[PDB]
Ligand binder design. Sequence first.
Ligand code: 3SG
Ligand code: 3SG
Lengths: 389, 392
Amino acid sequence: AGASRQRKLEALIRDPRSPINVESLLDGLNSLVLDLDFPALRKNKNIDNFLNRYEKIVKKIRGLQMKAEDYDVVKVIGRGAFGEVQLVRHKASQKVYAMKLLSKFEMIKRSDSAFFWEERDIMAFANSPWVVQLFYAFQDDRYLYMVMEYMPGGDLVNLMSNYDVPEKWAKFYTAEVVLALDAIHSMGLIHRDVKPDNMLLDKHGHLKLADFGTCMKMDETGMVHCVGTPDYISPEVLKSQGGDGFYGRECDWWSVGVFLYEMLVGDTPFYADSLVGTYSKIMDHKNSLCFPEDAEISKHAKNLICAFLTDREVRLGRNGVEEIRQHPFFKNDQWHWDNIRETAAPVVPELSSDIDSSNFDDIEDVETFPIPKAFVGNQLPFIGFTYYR
Amino acid sequence: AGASRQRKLEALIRDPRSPINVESLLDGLNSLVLDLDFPALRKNKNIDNFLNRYEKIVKKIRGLQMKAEDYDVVKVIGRGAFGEVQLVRHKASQKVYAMKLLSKFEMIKRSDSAFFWEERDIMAFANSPWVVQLFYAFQDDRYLYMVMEYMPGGDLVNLMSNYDVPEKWAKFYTAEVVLALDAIHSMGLIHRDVKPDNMLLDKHGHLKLADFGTCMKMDETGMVHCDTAVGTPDYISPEVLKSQGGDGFYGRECDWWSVGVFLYEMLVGDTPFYADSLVGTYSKIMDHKNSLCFPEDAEISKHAKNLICAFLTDREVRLGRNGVEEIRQHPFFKNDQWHWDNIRETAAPVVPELSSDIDSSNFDDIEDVETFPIPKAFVGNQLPFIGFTYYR
Ligand SMILES: COC(=O)c1ccc(F)c(NC(=O)c2cccc(-c3cc(C(=O)Nc4ccncc4F)ccc3CN)c2)c1
Ligand SMILES: COC(=O)c1ccc(F)c(NC(=O)c2cccc(-c3cc(C(=O)Nc4ccncc4F)ccc3CN)c2)c1
């Protein structure tokens, strides 16, 4: 009946995962207002009269909703392709978060614009201690904001540059990465850009993955038809960039092997001065993968590294994560796969307060959209991005 | 804290009086989809990706929401400037309604496009038995719809044309118009288009006002500021005629001129300033001091004649400056069938003979489409109708 219909649609609006939830529909009207309030378009009677009604309530609404002015910015802890990351303190609650800003301009211009949906879903609804939790997602006219839990231990790029990593440490950080990727794979997602920059460390020095712009949802077969600095990117993913090309979750396990090599060796296995150099070496990995004479690595460590860095058809982890996690290398008298994250981490950070950012390096140093004549609708891609947990 | 804000905003979305209630925000999404889904606009990647996402969910919502296909059209019972009015039966409930279609194309074309807000607000939130009530307001691509209560008795244009009205009946219906107009004034609204076309009679033959397109919201004093003259030529007050030519300040008195014109029509059988051209009618209305006169062959009583000349005078001396009180205590109204407090619970003059719930014998038959052009740029023809949807 009509009563049954209104019950059904009210379910579609209260659903926080729905595209027509109240935050999306409020995003829709706010995106419509921002996209229309220009003097050139206001010559149109339909557009000017529409703004006359809603201009008042839209300014009110935007005041009540969560915004950047609510958060005191303590420091900038990272920079990235489409923006930056800030250490922030929410003023009303005094709680410390890490807030990621992604530029709407840069996303629209350089033309990626769909990566942030999966990132937002994964961080909100992953519900895994291997993935950084998102608390709030919101936006203004220039930026998207993602308010995440603050990983105060820094990343593994910092850990490797400040410590010469022994093999017992390498077992730990590799095992945690394996578990973290298994978490993502189990959500039906291929990471396809795993690397120490995206591997953060929590309060107790335990790993959580932190960037998911590259993530993509798998098929029934498990494959994913569809960019970057190629250091950690597998051969098949590299070949795939040339036109079409299928690949699966094994591409992430290549990256793990690259990551294992780096920790024990100190350089990436396919390092070169140019991108074409690195690309070229990654394709000729059968001949170009080699260990230095003066880099004391064990038989099992070398065996695992060689297991991962091979063709996809015989790589470690086609048959499953099992054979990876029962490789001899991981045998130890400290932790087990079922209890690793509650055991003592190799490196616990010594921090003084809730805003201690000492394990992050310092960051040093504008343009936005042009005023349009016609309707371009730049805000339309960002409708339904707002999320309040 | 943030808790105080998210409760304040939640107050705004749940309220059906609010412009940002959920019904309106759905219209915001729906209108955007309609206004972008065209081949040339999909050449924009921003537009085409947005419509690739939402079109499916927007298609499911459109089927769930109330629509015209829910109703059986029994017979078309009226026509007006911006659309028609149909007699409908809701399929799921079998309940009879009169629903008014209003063409979005013609409203944008002839440019008015905001009269319907106060029409909707009155019917939705009047709660007076002098005003036809709106159960459901909705829309689609072409029409705004308003599902009202069916008034099977017909309008007063039909009553005066069928029956030859005596003054005992005219006391009654004029009284009901005054109480109806007083109600509308008591909501801060000048009707400024009172006439027998817009007076409908219910199951029992008691009046209800039933078109509010010309209606406008008053000031803190009671006056209104309007540049354009409005209303049907025959019943337009000289002050509203004179408002066309520049600055026009005037209060609720303009309605009583029309009640004046209305009473003259009932007893005399023709409208007081009739002319074969509209140009002549405006010339007669402006010269009402000399032009207003009765035929000799006419049996209108002195108290009847005293009331009409009381109404059809300049606003400075018109019966209505000192409120509704002075209208009610005129000797024409004084009788022993009804009091003012109980008039609508007394025996009406013309109780209709109604066989069935779809009896449209009081209304007459009707006899005899164009649409928007496919735009190249963003034009936004659905933006004036965002927030029109309403469910009781
Ligand atoms: C190169 O082409 C690509 O593959 C590609 C394509 C699309 C993309 F969106 C991106 N990534 C970004 O644009 C991007 C923008 C801004 C910040 C980051 C970023 C954030 C974090 C973080 O949240 N840390 C963090 C988390 C919690 N507590 C403290 C923290 F410090 C970590 C690392 C990074 C760099 N990965 C990434 C990359
Ligand atoms: C001349 O310019 C204006 O003053 C002006 C400006 C803007 C406007 F929107 C309009 N009105 C319309 O366009 C319009 C369109 C379609 C139907 C009507 C209309 C409807 C009714 C009705 O609801 N009856 C009714 C009610 C309940 N149960 C059964 C009924 F039968 C009565 C009378 C009428 C004519 N007034 C009016 C007029």
